């Protein structure tokens, strides 16, 4: 995260660390949607042009973390993945369309003050919150600068941006399964996600039920915090049905 602040303790209890078994290393962000299921971006597991194709084996999942680098001895919970599931139509070949993946844990995690699921939006929640100008919150242990690594989990709040503006800022083809966020050069307020923040949650607080919903997944972007450019996220609502589907065909 670029131009973010430190997260307070228990502020984003669904925040997950996608951790490599060896080299032991931060992979990406993810999010807890239940006691056995995790949501991340497919580009965290499979990205062939970079020879990236992680299996269940290769990874650990760490829940309830605050320190980026330390073993939080009786706070954090580490888990084994049972199986991994990628959108059958994830477009790694051209624009990260359908950048989403589910991970089912070997054993259900127990909730605590530091570990709690986020909600998945309903059709109605998406329509009232997903509006240009509305602010969302992104979190992660990612890059502080486009070109260190925070000690503690970082946070930033950014306004959703109009589709045209999104379209006009890149040469990459934007699909209805994506949305862009950030401030405008005019606005002069900054911040964005950065490498290492990928697969994390873009969350919103419903003003009607005062619950936190996950609207997006940190997907792609050109550099971090560049003026006139925005971050892009997978549109969670639009892929909800694939999600139900897989929960329904194999888990919980």
């Amino acid at each position: 995260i670029v131009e973010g602040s430190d997260a307070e303790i228990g502020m984003s209890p669904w925040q997950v660390m996608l951790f490599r078994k060896s080299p032991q290393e931060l992979l990406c962000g993810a999010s807890l949607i239940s006691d056995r299921w995790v949501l991340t971006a497919a580009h965290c597991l499979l990205y062939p042009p970079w020879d990236k194709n992680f299996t269940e084996n290769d990874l650990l999942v760490r829940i309830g973390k605050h320190s980026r680098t330390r073993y939080e001895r009786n706070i954090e919970k580490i888990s084994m993945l049972e199986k991994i599931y990628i959108h059958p139509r994830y477009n790694w070949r051209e624009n990260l369309d359908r950048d989403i993946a589910l991970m089912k844990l070997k054993k259900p995690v127990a909730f605590s003050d530091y570990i709690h699921p986020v909600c998945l939006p309903d059709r109605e929640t998406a329509a009232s919150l997903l509006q240009a100008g509305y602010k969302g919150r992104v979190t992660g242990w990612g890059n502080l600068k486009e070109t260190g690594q925070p000690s503690v989990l970082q946070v930033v709040n950014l306004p959703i941006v109009e589709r045209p503006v999104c379209k006009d800022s890149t040469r990459i083809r934007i699909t209805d399964n994506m949305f862009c966020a950030g401030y405008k050069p005019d606005e002069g307020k900054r911040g964005d996600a950065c490498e290492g923040d990928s697969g994390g949650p873009f969350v919103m607080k419903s003003p009607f039920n005062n619950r936190w919903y996950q609207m997006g997944i940190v997907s792609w972007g050109e550099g971090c915090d560049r003026d006139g450019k925005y971050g892009f996220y997978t549109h969670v609502f639009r892929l909800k049905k694939w999600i139900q589907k897989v929960i329904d065909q194999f888990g919980e």
């Binding site: 931060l26 965290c44 580490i78 992660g140 990612g142 950065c194 290492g196 940190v218």
Partner: peptide, 20 residues
């Protein structure tokens, strides 16, 4: 292009053998 990944420098604290 893609977040990609981040944090590779062993700068991390060893995790428990169990865990692993």
């Amino acid at each position: 292009x893609p977040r990609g990944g981040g944090g590779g420098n062993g700068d991390x604290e060893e995790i428990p053998e169990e865990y692993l």
